[PDB]
Amino acid sequence: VRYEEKRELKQLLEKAPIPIREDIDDPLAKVNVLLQSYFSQLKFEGFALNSDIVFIHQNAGRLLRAMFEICLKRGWGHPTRMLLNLCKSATTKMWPTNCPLRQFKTCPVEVIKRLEASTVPWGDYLQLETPAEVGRAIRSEKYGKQVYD
Amino acid sequence: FNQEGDYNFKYGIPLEFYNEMHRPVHFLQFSELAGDEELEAEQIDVFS
């Protein structure tokens, strides 16, 4: 932790949604809050932190896959399913409570924000049958049949 | 919370008190949608 970065890391630490026991002067917290900002797709100001977070996510794919292979081998259920989501978050750049249509690149912006706050079980959007019934559920007829595909 | 509502039930594994799925607010407040930003040619991962 350098001295000028502490103004900004304190601002990330309140956007950070999964808690950290450490303080701001520990290197264990800097790698922690920077990975949680990559998953949230946040923006920075510093030069050094913008090159640090690029180094984190390029390593974070393998290091989460290695921890997945251990905990699968040890016969552990509860750390396995958590670490299997963290392998998905590392490539798709998103938390597990977001809309699964964010993985499709060609899904329009207005439909995603409506599905994230709809509080409907997302399996109900899977069993829609026609693009007319999809377009009513997302309240957009002209973005029916794209979402249906 | 509907106290006088009616719920559907199933067999499953329960969740913890401060689970992700019990706090969907804390992930949708500050998150931004992903965009494609090109990196410098020395920052690209040598693995992939």
Binding site: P19 | F17, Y18
Partner: peptide, 24 residues
């Protein structure tokens, strides 16, 4: 308000309270 973080940290140690189980 952000005080749940201290509660969420302390709920990691709820599995240690079952070392003593007192049935009246």
């Amino acid at each position: 308000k952000n005080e749940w973080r201290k509660s969420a940290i302390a709920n990691t140690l709820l599995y240690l309270r079952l070392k003593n189980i007192y049935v009246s």
